Amino acid sequence: VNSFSGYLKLTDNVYIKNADIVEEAKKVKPTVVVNAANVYLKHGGGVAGALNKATNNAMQVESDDYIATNGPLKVGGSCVLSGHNLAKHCLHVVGPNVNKGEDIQLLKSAYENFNQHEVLLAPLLSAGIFGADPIHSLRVCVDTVRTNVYLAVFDKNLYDKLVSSFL
Ligand SMILES: OC[C@@H](COCc1ccccc1)Nc1ncnc2[nH]ccc12
Ligand SMILES: [Cl-]
DSSP states (O other), X not given: OOSOOSOEEOSXXXXXXXXXXXXXXXXXXXXXXXXXXXXXXXXXXXXXHHHHHHXXXXXXXXXXXXXXXXXXXXXXXXXXXXXXXXXSEEEEEOOOOGGGTOOTTHHHHHHHGGGGSXXXXXXXXXXXXXXXXXXXXXXXXXXXXXSEEEEEEXXXXXXXXXXXXXX
16 A cells, blocks of 8 residues: 555556646655656756756756766666655656657667666656657556556646547
8 A cells, every 4th residue: 555646547557647746746755756857867848847846956966966977878778866855766767759869669668667666656758848659658658667657647638548548
């Protein structure tokens, strides 16, 4: 039993809700919140910009030190950093950005990072400003993640389409 509330159950381990991941994280304070990161951990917009804003830019300051030490992430890769005031940890995961010409096949690799954590609050990877089809992202999530994932879909209209079209 966990403290996630109001989610629709899609499979044994995947759940979904129309919610703002920032507000969800503040309420639940989950062990792991997933950020929709880029390889430079530059949290400018989308989920990343919103999560960073909620940390009063502390996520960005920590991220800049991470990059200065380690260099950029790989597309499909991840790193674990602090969750600041939002969660214990933030798993920064880089899905492919179609608006940069990146290989959508890397979306499965991106979701594989979730399997290193027993329970996660997460957005749909490569959705939103990353330009991939969210119906596809949800399908890859369900077919790749085996740990317990609670998906927050910010847009109410898109949420209804994902549910009604879910196979
Ligand atoms: O795939 C993740 C994207 C999808 O939403 C954007 C969108 C706009 C119009 C139509 C479809 C989709 N972003 C988020 N998801 C959850 N919580 C969030 N908080 C702030 C951003 C954000
Ligand atoms: Cl977005």
